[PDB]
């Protein structure tokens, strides 16, 4: 019943008793494992609400009586009459933290208790969303001493439309095509760029044009919103010893802020609830800049390093990738912008695992996403067996609104 | 309603229909994935497994549903009646060994699966003769450094008689000598087999690269100790193309990776002694065997020697040191004219395998966490490929240590 979990570096054994509480079934069967897939393929609302409420009161040592009893009644009554319910603000804070804590693919969860919840539930229009987003970006960026923050927009209700940010992140670099179909800019953002132009925006020259937000309030078409250039903090990339690296003209923005996932708490669904923290350097250095389907700079940095690109056994890919990562770490530190290396981040995740073992009896973690995209077996997470499963509250993916 | 499989570098989409034929069950449920576990773990059932293998063999030679095919089925059912088991024909054993390689989810080398030399040792009768078959395996597979993939298959498990077992996890391994202050001299992964050897009467060395003897078990016999001839075991001194102090580390590795403690299963028959060999991918030596903290653990020493800043992680001293350790493995093996494949070439040929396999069987069992190399994962094309992991037979299986 209770999976045995071993660390092959130490020899230590634990048992995931928290896996037993799993719910919204994942994609694996005893016949075949789909753990590597990126996407796993009125009287129930109340049951998910009762469950979430009992979570809250256990956490504050307050299961069994007073306002525990009482709060269970008012949601019962509220859904009985309205067919929905509103979360108390401290609950919305509690649900936000737990959803971060339950995110299997996030290696940064050692921070799950330090999160700033901006309550935008009284939001009413698209111009209002933009003002909230700017308070978020400003507070979250904090002149480069970055601070985790989420902003929660109104919980979708039936009969009325949906609050949805159209961009996948708040800061995204446009991607423009060519006679060759080939992109200038970031190829992951080709679709949202062509939608931005097809909505008034005026495409620019270069690789690092910060996209305009496409914000949409219920039953309205999206609305463009240009971002304040002083509010989009960016870091130009230099290398500590390769003097020519700066002249490649590479940049990356400071604030990773994901604005297209659905926050679910106690049976309510928040289609627009952008959250942000701070980068892990391999995300910028390895995936965004070196993926063949992203900026794909790997061969260009290898030529500058006079590496031999004619045979793979010179490990020229590995030498260039490491140095790109060094340049990210150096440039962010020189700019006083919070960043963390994959070694520090993974070592803290191990510490998170131990904390969460004694607290909740285990921790849902997705091995293929915790292990860094470079130097995997040199970080402790590589040697650590992990159990993956869905708990609530949770962040979920959701179809794009078109 | 079979898994949809996506490649994210390119956009390809496939459906793994082969996974519907998965002849057993693994550790995952809809409630929780346990893919990262290292060990995921009756005449009528022997008959239904054998019937399935005979059906495979006769498909592969384009004789399905033929007279020869029905005759063979009746033969097997009759021999399970008279004796409780059956014997494979020679050609069936060759095909079954190739399919077990082909079916192994954690092997990135399977582009090669059809080039396998199968040594039939099912007439073996003692440990001494076991030793002879094994020396011949090592000699043919090493081939003076132009490595050849081979399997030697010893007699199947059968009732009434104990098993042939190779006690060593590989045919070539280095001793690990326990010490005080509790440290290990040599390979710490082999501390246990090293003691068994000494307690079964082996005079130990005291180096870090001392080749272990073989502990070989005939049925209902105690294991017997055999020293490999030094000149049968090809080895590679490690040096680095530009860091000349590297050679002064005194590091070595052996040419032939020959796994000897797994069970080969075909048509319900079990072969607990069937060692098999190919050639190394450089990351197994460079990253795992040499840089794992619980193996030779040379990362920090290399980094200090490189004058890297080991006081802070953000210099990426570990990454830089490990890359050069891999360069040195590749450089040394190529200098010595010993076959070796780097993680880039290996993973690219696995991508071609996946395409070969999709067209041929409608999919391919693959374990993403083991296929993706331990350095530079997303620099390789397998990182961006979704995979479906499942168990087909014939198969290589883990089996418990005989002590
Ligand atoms: C504070 C520093 C943080 C770091 C270093 C960090 C790091 C990461 C990384 C590396 C990923 C992998 C995604 C990818 O590689 O594509 C990830 C995913 C994710 N993170 Fe974190 N993150 C941080 C903060 C946060 C915050 C503040 C939240 C929510 C409030 C959060 C929730 C998530 C979620 C939901 C995912 C999606 C993965 C899933 O499906 O579970 N993270 N994070
Ligand atoms: C010819 C070159 C070959 C290469 C480069 C290769 C490569 C690899 C690598 C890198 C691993 C994973 C080990 C690790 O990373 O810890 C592996 C596993 C494995 N390989 Fe290969 N291999 C080769 C030949 C063979 C042969 C000849 C056989 C059997 C006849 C074989 C069967 C296996 C099996 C059974 C596993 C374990 C799979 C599992 O537990 O699911 N390989 N291989
Ligand atoms: C708060 C935060 C901080 C940080 N440092 N990193 C973060 C990374 C993600 C993230 C989650 C899922 C993702 O993938 C979804 C696939 C569908 C299209 C890609 C990706 C990009 N792969 C990023 C989300 C939040 C992050
Ligand atoms: C023919 C061959 C060639 C090659 N180049 N490599 C090979 C690697 C393995 C192999 C199998 C299982 C392993 O581990 C199993 C866990 C249980 C105890 C460890 C490991 C080491 N990870 C390697 C087996 C055969 C290989
Ligand atoms: C196919 C494969 O699962 C996919 O490329 C995953 C692998 N692991 C990952 N891990 C992280 N952190 N981010 C990713 O985008 C991916 N991609
Ligand atoms: C616990 C963890 O899954 C384990 O160490 C695995 C991960 N992936 C691996 N992948 C390969 N190829 N070889 C290994 O030894 C491992 N180890
Ligand atoms: Cl990003
Ligand atoms: Cl090995
Ligand atoms: Gd130059
Ligand atoms: Gd030198
Ligand atoms: Zn699974």
mmCIF file of N, CA and C in Angstrom, chain A residues 154-157 160-164 216-219 269 271 398:
data_model
loop_
_atom_site.group_PDB
_atom_site.id
_atom_site.type_symbol
_atom_site.label_atom_id
_atom_site.label_comp_id
_atom_site.label_asym_id
_atom_site.label_seq_id
_atom_site.Cartn_x
_atom_site.Cartn_y
_atom_site.Cartn_z
ATOM 1 N N UNK A 154 -10.955 36.714 -10.136
ATOM 2 C CA UNK A 154 -12.229 36.136 -9.684
ATOM 3 C C UNK A 154 -12.428 34.702 -10.148
ATOM 4 N N UNK A 155 -12.875 33.862 -9.214
ATOM 5 C CA UNK A 155 -13.200 32.465 -9.480
ATOM 6 C C UNK A 155 -14.302 32.339 -10.523
ATOM 7 N N UNK A 156 -13.985 31.743 -11.671
ATOM 8 C CA UNK A 156 -14.975 31.511 -12.719
ATOM 9 C C UNK A 156 -16.282 30.970 -12.149
ATOM 10 N N UNK A 157 -17.393 31.472 -12.677
ATOM 11 C CA UNK A 157 -18.732 31.014 -12.352
ATOM 12 C C UNK A 157 -19.474 30.681 -13.638
ATOM 13 N N UNK A 160 -21.454 33.134 -16.815
ATOM 14 C CA UNK A 160 -20.580 34.266 -17.074
ATOM 15 C C UNK A 160 -19.262 33.764 -17.649
ATOM 16 N N UNK A 161 -18.643 34.594 -18.492
ATOM 17 C CA UNK A 161 -17.383 34.274 -19.137
ATOM 18 C C UNK A 161 -16.202 34.014 -18.220
ATOM 19 N N UNK A 162 -14.994 34.229 -18.731
ATOM 20 C CA UNK A 162 -13.793 33.770 -18.048
ATOM 21 C C UNK A 162 -12.721 34.850 -18.041
ATOM 22 N N UNK A 163 -12.117 35.074 -16.871
ATOM 23 C CA UNK A 163 -10.893 35.864 -16.764
ATOM 24 C C UNK A 163 -9.700 35.003 -17.181
ATOM 25 N N UNK A 164 -8.952 35.454 -18.189
ATOM 26 C CA UNK A 164 -7.834 34.674 -18.710
ATOM 27 C C UNK A 164 -6.781 35.607 -19.289
ATOM 28 N N UNK A 216 -8.058 39.661 -21.157
ATOM 29 C CA UNK A 216 -9.441 39.451 -21.566
ATOM 30 C C UNK A 216 -10.303 39.169 -20.344
ATOM 31 N N UNK A 217 -11.331 40.021 -20.137
ATOM 32 C CA UNK A 217 -12.365 39.930 -19.126
ATOM 33 C C UNK A 217 -13.579 39.220 -19.702
ATOM 34 N N UNK A 218 -14.494 38.734 -18.855
ATOM 35 C CA UNK A 218 -15.568 37.851 -19.340
ATOM 36 C C UNK A 218 -16.320 38.395 -20.552
ATOM 37 N N UNK A 219 -16.526 37.518 -21.533
ATOM 38 C CA UNK A 219 -17.363 37.765 -22.706
ATOM 39 C C UNK A 219 -16.906 38.962 -23.525
ATOM 40 N N UNK A 269 -12.325 27.153 -9.290
ATOM 41 C CA UNK A 269 -11.353 27.194 -10.373
ATOM 42 C C UNK A 269 -11.046 28.647 -10.708
ATOM 43 N N UNK A 271 -9.210 30.580 -13.377
ATOM 44 C CA UNK A 271 -8.503 30.509 -14.671
ATOM 45 C C UNK A 271 -7.401 31.545 -14.840
ATOM 46 N N UNK A 398 -4.536 24.185 -18.624
ATOM 47 C CA UNK A 398 -5.884 24.380 -19.141
ATOM 48 C C UNK A 398 -5.803 24.752 -20.612
#
